[PDB]
Every structure is written in structure tokens, then in C-alpha cells.
């Protein structure tokens, strides 16, 4: 026999991260450089795969949901250190932030999906993208995954502004 469990979101987690700034990327034009604030002597560069989506200019010095234990991978050549959670649709794209608070410590986790990573969620496990198609904004534009709420414990649900029926990634 084997475990063979299906994909589920309790196998991952997300936290509020702070962007310091954004500028042009060294590798191809289809990427943009951005810097995330962490417990280091200096911020760390990240690389986002966006060519005709929310501009880096709108994400400059922003605070949004980013990967807590999920691991990033290389893009073109640069290796990102984090990734910004946003809602995507062909009409527009918007980063998802909670309507208030946005403190760099809050992590979206609810008793509806209990789970933790073993060592770290290595990028080779492809966990994030495994369940990614199952995360969409409802009619009320609330990001919902696996039919469970997206919020920091009790209170503080993260919702989109105009992103309804859009896939979240």
C-alpha cells in the first residue's frame, strides 16, 4: 500500500510580508525585481513573473500576503526569495491584502484546515501549484480555497476589491 493522499491546502501556509521597493530586473524584460523585508542586515531581492499584470510601481513598498513556509524557485536565472499572492484574470490583476491590520506577523490559518510543514515546503514538492487551481474569489470576491475561508484565525478575512470568479495565485 501507499499513502497517496490527494492535494489539500492545510499542507501549506501564508503570512503578511513587506515589500521595500521594486525596480527593473537583470534577466529578461518579462520579469521585475522587487525587495522583501526580512530579519537580515539588508532586504532580499525577489523575482515575479509578470509582463502585463499589476505593475511593480503599484506594488512598490506594499504589504500583502506572501509565502510563509512555501519555497520559491528560479525564474529565468534569478532565484526569488518570496512570492506575492494575487488574483489573476484576463481583464485585470489585483494583489490580495486583508481589509485592515496587515501586520507583518499575521498568518492566514483556520481550524478548518489544520496542518504544518515537516522541514520546509521544498519547491520540488510542487505543493503550492498543486492546489492553486482550487483557489478562487467567490461572487463577493472573497478568496476561497478548497471551499474553506481565507482569514487570520478568527476575524480578518482577506478579500479582493473587484476580482470576482478569478483564480488566485
Curated annotation (Swiss-Prot):
Cystine connections: none
Highest rank taxon of the organism: Eukaryota
N6-succinyllysine, modified sites: 126
Coiled-coil intervals, chain numbering: none
Domain named tRNA-binding: residues: 8-109
Identification of the protein by name: Endothelial monocyte-activating polypeptide 2
Organism of derivation: Homo sapiens (Human)
Higher taxonomy: Eukaryota, Metazoa, Chordata, Craniata, Vertebrata
Name of the gene this protein is made from: AIMP1
Amino acid at each position: 500500500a501507499m499513502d497517496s493522499k490527494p492535494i489539500d491546502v492545510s499542507r501549506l501556509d501564508l503570512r503578511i510580508g513587506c515589500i521595500i521597493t521594486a525596480r527593473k530586473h537583470p534577466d529578461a524584460d518579462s520579469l521585475y525585481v522587487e525587495e522583501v523585508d526580512v530579519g537580515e542586515i539588508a532586504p532580499r531581492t525577489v523575482v515575479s513573473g509578470l509582463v502585463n499584470h499589476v505593475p511593480l510601481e503599484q506594488m512598490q513598498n506594499r504589504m500583502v500576503i506572501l509565502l510563509c513556509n512555501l519555497k520559491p524557485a528560479k525564474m529565468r536565472g534569478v532565484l526569488s526569495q518570496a512570492m506575492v499572492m494575487c488574483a489573476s484574470s484576463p481583464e485585470k490583476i489585483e494583489i490580495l491584502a486583508p481589509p485592515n491590520g496587515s501586520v507583518p506577523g499575521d498568518r492566514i490559518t483556520f481550524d478548518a484546515f489544520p496542518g504544518e510543514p515537516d522541514k520546509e515546503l521544498n519547491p520540488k514538492k510542487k505543493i503550492w501549484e498543486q492546489i492553486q487551481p482550487d483557489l478562487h474569489t467567490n461572487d463577493e470576491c472573497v478568496a476561497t480555497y478548497k471551499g474553506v475561508p481565507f482569514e487570520v484565525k478568527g476575524k480578518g478575512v482577506c478579500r479582493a476589491q473587484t476580482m470576482s470568479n478569478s483564480g488566485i495565485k
